[PDB]
Amino acid sequence: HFEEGERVLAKHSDCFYEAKVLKVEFKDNEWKYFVHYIGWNKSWDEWIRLDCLLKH
Secondary structure, three states: OOOOOOEEEEEEOOOEEEEEEEEEEEEEOOOHHHHHEEOOOHOOOEEHHHHEEEOO
16 A cells, blocks of 8 residues: 555654655565665665554
């Protein structure tokens, strides 16, 4: 429900970080979104669920 490359807010731990969507994938009856956290290396890039995403 989010285009790739789209800038969003992604929740990691307690707060939301400004992020960018790198991949969108569907599997096992569910969406999962690979995001980059602006300010942080590829190291910190990770998959996350819809729950954790927020439209800018």
